[PDB]
């Protein structure tokens, strides 16, 4: 629902 700082270590995009 809100955007985080993703950074290099997150598979936040499924």
């Amino acid at each position, epitope marked *: 629902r809100k955007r985080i700082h*993703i950074g290099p270590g997150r598979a936040f995009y499924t």
Partner: antibody
Amino acid sequence: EVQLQESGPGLVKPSETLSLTCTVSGGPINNAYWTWIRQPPGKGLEYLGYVYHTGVTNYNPSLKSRLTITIDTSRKQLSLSLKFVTAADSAVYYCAREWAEDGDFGNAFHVWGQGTMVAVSS
Amino acid sequence: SYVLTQPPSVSVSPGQTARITCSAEALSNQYAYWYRQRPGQAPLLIIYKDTKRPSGIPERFSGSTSGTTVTLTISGVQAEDEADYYCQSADSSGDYVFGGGTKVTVLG
């Protein structure tokens, strides 16, 4: 179980470079943004930056030009380098873990070291 | 660039509910995070992503979000809750910002 231990010189002269080290134990060096945060006596917290295990960094925009953070994955240690210090840099410097993995807490610092006191003085 | 605005002090009596607000235009599309810091101590994460509690944190600590304002609510406040409470956020670019902190004082 992740524990963080900061080490520093205690005292740095104005205009010199501050060097600190944080040692990580009780957990993996992967899946975390290893973070430096500071707090001047009687004042609030201020973000400094992170390093990821691959060496990727992220800095507070206001301090980027003076700040370098590095990681040694083999020793499970990260280091802070802050150039040209003044009295404004006198603070307790904390090492903290931002967990970065499926199921994490987002952009939060869930474990902190006890901090290391740095005085900038002649 | 953004700044997180929280009151420097909140006073409550024992058994009452303390409410600490943190506000910024940035908070409309950014998560907030709450920390408790006791004197001479490292901060403790109490709320993440606006409303979520870590495992060790009891239900008496609740986070809420409303537009550009987040609120930390502490119910059943006692003397042991006296501490500094910090709000924190991050934007997409990796600009992490802390609020100035709120000192909770328990009266009486």
